[PDB]
Amino acid sequence: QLTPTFYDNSCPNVSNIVRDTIVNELRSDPRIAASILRLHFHDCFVNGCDASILLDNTTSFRTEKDAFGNANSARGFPVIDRMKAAVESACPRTVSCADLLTIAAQQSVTLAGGPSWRVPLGRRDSLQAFLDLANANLPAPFFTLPQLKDSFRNVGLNRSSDLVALSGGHTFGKNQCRFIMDRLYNFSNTGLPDPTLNTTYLQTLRGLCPLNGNLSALVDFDLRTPTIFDNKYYVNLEEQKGLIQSDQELFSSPNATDTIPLVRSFANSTQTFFNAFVEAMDRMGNITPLTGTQGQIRLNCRVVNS
Ligand code: HEM
Ligand SMILES: [Ca+2]
Ligand SMILES: [Ca+2]
């Protein structure tokens, strides 16, 4: 069983070291908190939160970093290396990369203005990476609501609250133009923009992402508060201003009978959202963890111990 007090004797300063690293990095890279939270998400959705995503290529297995959902998208790996080294110095061979990333995600959310809580700990590190599994399990922005629900259920998160609350991670961070081009100019081969995208916002996004323009250009997920972790993401959805298809579908999908009330509840109360987010975050963090003597306490998050 994972417990929040796992390192209270072996490495009481772990949370503080992780926080200090992120605070320092945020000065030069204001996007890092968002990036780190996303790394934890992509770790947990592939064989559980086992730091499998942190492993680099080997001749026996490919890295998850080359997955369609990670390639030229996932970032912050050097920052994780930095905090890992700092933690290893303070507490040699004690904190797993899986746990380190979980703490980093939580601290990132709090540093960005989100809720503060102690995450369950005790996870151990994988002995391999899972590229095929990542390509299969990571959801995509073009998923319909049923597909989004399928993706979450596939990894163990059955609740619509899991999906709606965790999607709140898009209250900050960036998204490439490439992922909304269809919504802007030719949605579902209709030759027209996505009708669920606010027409005023449509104009703004078209200006940032012109047809035949730089597909790698970055746009903010939350037009209200781009770098602050708050419930503004849901207020946007209510006005048809969700950035990607998967965002807006939580409120506009024909299958959104169960998600609409959740979106409204989170838009109406920061407390309701924050509570739901912590609850869902801990559930995602409890996905098939290696514990006890299973796996290892990786010394270098990029490679399995030898
Ligand atoms: C429900 C399905 C989801 C889909 C389809 C999805 C899709 C995406 C896409 C397309 C990007 C843009 C990547 C890029 O342009 O390079 C992204 C970024 C991001 N996502 Fe999600 N996401 C989902 C769920 C989540 C969850 C559960 C979290 C965390 C709790 C999360 C946190 C983030 C963050 C914080 C970013 C910004 C990262 C950065 O700026 O470096 N996402 N997501
Ligand atoms: Ca994983
Ligand atoms: Ca925000």
3 state SS of 279 = helix
Q: How far is the CA of 169 from the centre of ligand 1 (A)?
A: 7
| Residues 106, 35 contacting (CB under 8 angstroms) | no
| Residue 124 region by backbone torsions, left for phi larger than 0, else alpha for psi between -120 and 50, else beta | beta
From 44, 170, 214, 281, mutation site for ligand 1 pocket: most ligand atoms within 8 A of C-beta = 170
Q: How far apart are the first and last CA of the chain?
A: 27
Which residues touch 43 (CB under 8 Å, ≥6 apart)? 49, 50, 51, 52, 53, 54, 98, 101
Q: How far is the CA of 244 from the centre of ligand 3 (A)?
A: 15
- Data resolution in angstroms: 1.6
| Residues 53, 64 contacting (CB under 8 angstroms) | yes
Q: How far is the CA of 31 from the centre of ligand 2 (A)?
A: 22
CA dist 126 to 26, 48, 53, 98, Å? Answer: 29, 9, 9, 8
Q: What are phi and psi of 290, to 5 degrees?
A: -90, 135
Class of domain 139-284: mainly alpha
User: CA-to-CA distance for 204 and 224, rounded, in angstroms?
Assistant: 13
| Residue 189 region by backbone torsions, left for phi larger than 0, else alpha for psi between -120 and 50, else beta | left
CB under 6 Å to ligand 1: residues?
31, 34-35, 37-38, 41, 73, 75, 139-141, 143, 148, 166-167, 169-170, 173-176, 179, 244, 246
Residues annotated in the binding site for Ca(2+), as ranges? 43, 46, 48, 50, 52, 64, 171, 222, 225, 230
Q: Where in the chain is the domain with CATH 1.10.520.10?
A: 2-138+285-305
Q: How far is the CA of 49 from the centre of ligand 1 (A)?
A: 16
Exactly one of 38, 42, 65, 183 is catalytic; name it. Answer: 42
Listed residue (125, 168, 142) closest to 245, CA to CA: 142
Q: How many CB atoms lie within 10 A of CB 92?
A: 11
Q: Where in the chain is the domain with CATH 1.10.420.10?
A: 139-284
Listed residue (104, 123, 164, 54) closest to 287, CA to CA: 123
- 42 labelled catalytic: yes
Task: Note the CATH number of domain 2-138+285-305.
Answer: 1.10.520.10
Q: Which ligand is closest in space to the CA of residue 44?
A: 2
Residues annotated in the binding site for heme b, as ranges? 170
Q: Which amino acid is at 116?
A: S
Element holding 176 (H helix, E strand) = strand 174-176
3 state SS of 197 = coil
Chain centre to alpha carbon of residue 35:
7
